Tab-separated table of C-alpha atoms in Angstrom:
chain	number	residue	atom	x	y	z
A	1	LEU	CA	-11.389	3.761	-14.893
A	2	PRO	CA	-12.679	2.519	-11.590
A	3	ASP	CA	-11.695	4.367	-8.465
A	4	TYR	CA	-10.713	1.246	-6.336
A	5	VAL	CA	-8.899	-1.292	-7.879
A	6	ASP	CA	-8.214	-4.596	-5.212
A	7	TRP	CA	-6.561	-7.633	-6.953
A	8	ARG	CA	-6.567	-9.341	-3.254
A	9	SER	CA	-9.938	-8.796	-2.937
A	10	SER	CA	-11.162	-11.048	-6.286
A	11	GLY	CA	-8.687	-13.761	-5.028
A	12	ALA	CA	-5.601	-13.028	-8.019
A	13	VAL	CA	-3.075	-12.474	-5.682
A	14	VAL	CA	-0.652	-15.281	-3.451
A	15	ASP	CA	-0.289	-15.090	0.165
A	16	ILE	CA	2.720	-12.151	1.148
A	17	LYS	CA	5.814	-14.084	0.296
A	18	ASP	CA	9.599	-13.458	1.403
A	19	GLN	CA	12.740	-13.923	-0.815
A	20	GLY	CA	14.891	-13.842	2.452
A	21	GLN	CA	18.476	-13.158	2.412
A	22	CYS	CA	18.640	-12.641	-1.480
A	23	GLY	CA	18.204	-9.942	-3.988
A	24	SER	CA	15.599	-12.368	-6.059
A	25	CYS	CA	13.134	-9.509	-6.000
A	26	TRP	CA	12.628	-9.462	-9.965
A	27	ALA	CA	11.968	-12.658	-9.414
A	28	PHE	CA	9.022	-12.444	-6.656
A	29	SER	CA	7.832	-9.520	-9.163
A	30	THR	CA	7.493	-11.668	-12.398
A	31	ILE	CA	5.734	-14.419	-10.178
A	32	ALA	CA	3.255	-12.229	-8.760
A	33	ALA	CA	2.615	-10.697	-11.959
A	34	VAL	CA	2.368	-13.783	-13.725
A	35	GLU	CA	-0.037	-15.628	-10.466
A	36	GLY	CA	-2.363	-12.266	-11.539
A	37	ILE	CA	-3.100	-13.212	-14.977
A	38	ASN	CA	-3.148	-16.712	-14.497
A	39	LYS	CA	-6.168	-15.988	-11.882
A	40	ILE	CA	-7.481	-12.789	-14.118
A	41	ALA	CA	-7.688	-15.068	-17.596
A	42	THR	CA	-8.576	-18.573	-16.527
A	43	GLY	CA	-10.254	-18.804	-12.873
A	44	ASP	CA	-7.485	-20.421	-11.392
A	45	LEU	CA	-4.958	-18.927	-8.404
A	46	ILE	CA	-2.110	-20.815	-8.480
A	47	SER	CA	1.313	-20.477	-6.483
A	48	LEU	CA	4.024	-20.642	-8.779
A	49	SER	CA	8.186	-20.623	-8.569
A	50	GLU	CA	10.478	-18.316	-8.057
A	51	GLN	CA	13.406	-20.683	-7.586
A	52	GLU	CA	12.869	-21.578	-10.916
A	53	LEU	CA	13.400	-18.119	-12.220
A	54	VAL	CA	16.948	-18.003	-9.985
A	55	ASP	CA	18.225	-20.872	-11.066
A	56	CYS	CA	16.944	-21.454	-15.020
A	57	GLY	CA	16.517	-17.619	-15.962
A	58	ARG	CA	19.778	-16.856	-15.412
A	59	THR	CA	20.315	-13.786	-18.725
A	60	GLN	CA	23.406	-11.522	-19.079
A	61	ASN	CA	21.712	-9.178	-16.990
A	62	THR	CA	19.599	-10.811	-14.459
A	63	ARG	CA	21.408	-13.095	-12.084
A	64	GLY	CA	19.560	-14.697	-9.555
A	65	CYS	CA	20.409	-13.487	-6.110
A	66	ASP	CA	22.306	-10.905	-7.502
A	67	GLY	CA	19.123	-8.611	-8.801
A	68	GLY	CA	17.821	-9.302	-12.204
A	69	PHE	CA	14.632	-7.997	-14.270
A	70	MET	CA	10.877	-8.374	-14.799
A	71	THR	CA	11.063	-8.699	-18.216
A	72	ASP	CA	13.794	-11.343	-18.028
A	73	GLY	CA	11.370	-13.533	-16.130
A	74	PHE	CA	8.913	-13.074	-18.542
A	75	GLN	CA	10.563	-13.903	-21.445
A	76	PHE	CA	12.319	-17.040	-19.692
A	77	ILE	CA	8.748	-18.547	-18.957
A	78	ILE	CA	7.605	-17.467	-22.889
A	79	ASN	CA	10.617	-19.355	-23.906
A	80	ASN	CA	9.939	-22.305	-21.728
A	81	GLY	CA	6.591	-22.406	-22.484
A	82	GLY	CA	5.660	-21.890	-18.712
A	83	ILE	CA	6.661	-22.010	-15.461
A	84	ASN	CA	6.254	-24.957	-12.686
A	85	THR	CA	4.228	-24.359	-9.161
A	86	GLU	CA	6.086	-22.805	-5.909
A	87	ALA	CA	4.677	-26.099	-4.659
A	88	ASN	CA	6.875	-28.572	-6.709
A	89	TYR	CA	9.959	-25.930	-7.536
A	90	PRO	CA	10.195	-24.863	-3.856
A	91	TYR	CA	12.313	-21.498	-2.805
A	92	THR	CA	15.620	-21.902	-0.892
A	93	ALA	CA	16.561	-18.050	-1.236
A	94	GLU	CA	20.460	-19.566	-2.852
A	95	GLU	CA	21.113	-20.023	-5.941
A	96	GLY	CA	21.056	-23.520	-7.355
A	97	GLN	CA	21.781	-25.631	-10.408
A	98	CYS	CA	18.286	-25.391	-12.692
A	99	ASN	CA	16.301	-28.726	-11.999
A	100	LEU	CA	15.765	-29.638	-15.259
A	101	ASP	CA	12.751	-32.324	-14.563
A	102	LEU	CA	11.380	-29.233	-12.954
A	103	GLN	CA	11.578	-26.855	-15.177
A	104	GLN	CA	9.839	-29.426	-18.035
A	105	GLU	CA	6.762	-29.186	-15.778
A	106	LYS	CA	4.418	-26.326	-16.686
A	107	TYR	CA	1.638	-25.353	-14.967
A	108	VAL	CA	0.888	-21.623	-16.317
A	109	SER	CA	2.328	-20.348	-19.003
A	110	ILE	CA	1.947	-16.595	-20.629
A	111	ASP	CA	1.667	-15.465	-24.057
A	112	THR	CA	3.696	-12.073	-24.562
A	113	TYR	CA	4.662	-9.140	-22.203
A	114	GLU	CA	4.490	-5.444	-22.222
A	115	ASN	CA	6.281	-2.591	-21.243
A	116	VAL	CA	3.968	0.369	-19.431
A	117	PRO	CA	5.215	3.833	-21.243
A	118	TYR	CA	7.832	5.138	-18.911
A	119	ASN	CA	6.945	7.697	-16.585
A	120	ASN	CA	3.015	7.632	-17.230
A	121	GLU	CA	1.135	7.420	-13.689
A	122	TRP	CA	-2.126	6.664	-16.295
A	123	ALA	CA	-0.894	4.397	-17.871
A	124	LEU	CA	0.449	2.412	-15.217
A	125	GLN	CA	-3.356	2.939	-14.100
A	126	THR	CA	-4.692	1.678	-16.926
A	127	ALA	CA	-2.640	-0.976	-16.596
A	128	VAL	CA	-3.217	-1.792	-13.227
A	129	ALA	CA	-7.028	-1.711	-13.764
A	130	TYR	CA	-6.882	-4.763	-15.606
A	131	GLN	CA	-4.293	-6.792	-13.885
A	132	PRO	CA	-1.245	-6.877	-11.325
A	133	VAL	CA	2.189	-5.257	-12.757
A	134	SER	CA	5.487	-5.592	-12.247
A	135	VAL	CA	7.099	-2.645	-11.356
A	136	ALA	CA	10.768	-1.293	-9.626
A	137	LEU	CA	11.403	1.723	-6.642
A	138	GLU	CA	13.608	2.708	-4.929
A	139	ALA	CA	12.867	0.578	-1.490
A	140	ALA	CA	17.181	1.242	0.456
A	141	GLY	CA	16.212	4.013	2.354
A	142	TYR	CA	15.256	4.161	6.430
A	143	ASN	CA	12.032	5.580	5.789
A	144	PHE	CA	11.196	2.833	3.618
A	145	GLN	CA	12.699	-0.039	5.191
A	146	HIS	CA	10.497	1.035	8.520
A	147	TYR	CA	7.358	1.983	7.132
A	148	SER	CA	4.543	-0.006	8.622
A	149	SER	CA	1.506	1.973	7.952
A	150	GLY	CA	-0.324	4.784	6.169
A	151	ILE	CA	0.342	5.869	2.579
A	152	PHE	CA	4.357	6.224	2.144
A	153	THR	CA	5.168	10.005	0.715
A	154	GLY	CA	8.518	9.598	1.085
A	155	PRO	CA	11.160	10.413	1.450
A	156	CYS	CA	12.746	8.576	-1.474
A	157	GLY	CA	15.195	8.505	-4.182
A	158	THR	CA	13.732	7.306	-7.578
A	159	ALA	CA	16.712	4.649	-8.744
A	160	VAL	CA	15.260	1.999	-9.088
A	161	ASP	CA	16.895	-0.538	-7.036
A	162	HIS	CA	14.104	-3.179	-5.514
A	163	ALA	CA	11.314	-4.787	-7.617
A	164	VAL	CA	7.657	-4.761	-6.300
A	165	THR	CA	4.063	-5.953	-8.060
A	166	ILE	CA	0.801	-3.720	-7.780
A	167	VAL	CA	-1.902	-5.002	-7.057
A	168	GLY	CA	-4.155	-2.024	-6.994
A	169	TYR	CA	-5.019	1.227	-5.969
A	170	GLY	CA	-7.395	3.463	-4.266
A	171	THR	CA	-7.892	6.791	-2.452
A	172	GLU	CA	-8.307	7.710	1.442
A	173	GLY	CA	-8.142	11.273	2.903
A	174	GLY	CA	-8.156	12.612	-0.297
A	175	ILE	CA	-4.756	10.940	-0.649
A	176	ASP	CA	-4.687	8.807	-3.967
A	177	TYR	CA	-2.102	5.689	-3.289
A	178	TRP	CA	-1.247	2.360	-5.104
A	179	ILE	CA	-0.834	-1.050	-3.414
A	180	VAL	CA	2.151	-2.431	-3.636
A	181	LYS	CA	2.859	-5.882	-2.756
A	182	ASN	CA	7.079	-6.502	-1.446
A	183	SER	CA	8.596	-10.045	-0.490
A	184	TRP	CA	9.738	-8.941	2.334
A	185	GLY	CA	7.335	-11.130	4.401
A	186	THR	CA	4.262	-10.117	6.390
A	187	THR	CA	6.320	-8.450	9.248
A	188	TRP	CA	6.996	-5.542	6.687
A	189	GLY	CA	4.313	-2.659	6.385
A	190	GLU	CA	0.571	-3.443	6.066
A	191	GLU	CA	0.909	-7.446	6.751
A	192	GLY	CA	3.607	-7.568	3.612
A	193	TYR	CA	1.601	-4.492	1.345
A	194	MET	CA	2.368	-1.084	1.174
A	195	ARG	CA	-0.073	2.042	0.481
A	196	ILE	CA	2.460	4.356	-1.971
A	197	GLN	CA	1.839	8.140	-2.719
A	198	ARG	CA	-0.151	7.646	-6.464
A	199	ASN	CA	-0.844	11.004	-8.872
A	200	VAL	CA	2.290	12.687	-7.855
A	201	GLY	CA	3.795	13.107	-11.875
A	202	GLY	CA	6.785	12.287	-13.457
A	203	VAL	CA	8.313	9.035	-12.184
A	204	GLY	CA	6.059	8.339	-9.864
A	205	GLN	CA	6.780	7.800	-5.902
A	206	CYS	CA	9.868	6.549	-5.710
A	207	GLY	CA	10.374	6.156	-8.977
A	208	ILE	CA	7.500	3.522	-9.569
A	209	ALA	CA	6.858	4.837	-13.114
A	210	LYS	CA	9.984	3.893	-14.613
A	211	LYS	CA	10.105	-0.136	-15.634
A	212	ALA	CA	6.778	-0.998	-14.932
A	213	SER	CA	5.971	-4.123	-17.125
A	214	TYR	CA	3.247	-7.097	-17.371
A	215	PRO	CA	2.400	-10.217	-18.759
A	216	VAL	CA	-0.243	-10.949	-21.325
A	217	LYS	CA	-2.310	-13.985	-22.183
A	218	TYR	CA	-4.575	-14.068	-25.478
A	219	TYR	CA	-7.361	-15.641	-24.005
A	220	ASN	CA	-10.284	-15.190	-21.317
């Protein structure tokens, strides 16, 4: 695998977004991964609608601003035959009624999704070498919350509670890291991103390797 990967460098990552006062992170992670594979497979970068997932993608386990799962996000886009753009179905940071007309407008599609084998940073690295990958991690701790620069090495728990998107990886000063795209706006971390320690084993740093998944498009 490559020594360094950064999906931002090849125009596969939309500018940093802010979920605001709403636990919709599963939706931001779903969308960032779909945005990535769409650029990789088709050549065009399009900013897509988190609000559509929040309003229209509710399940037994996925509950808009009350948390959810990227697998349900991917499932919705597959089931619906696509997803609308950010511009057409804008983000409100509030749970609203599913706009059926906007739901019918489809600008990006995915064919399938896959789960990265659990607790396997090597499998995760393999997946990230091909595309941005949706992950969940433990983001509730003071140090994670106040992260501003460098490679985050903890402390943090492992009990997944917040979804982000891995958009690359690398090594600096002998320390391996993942590049994480968060949805807390540009004022958090390294202009919205975090470098977080990689190759620590097991569940990965802050549990990052526990529940990784990515969307699939059959044709390039």
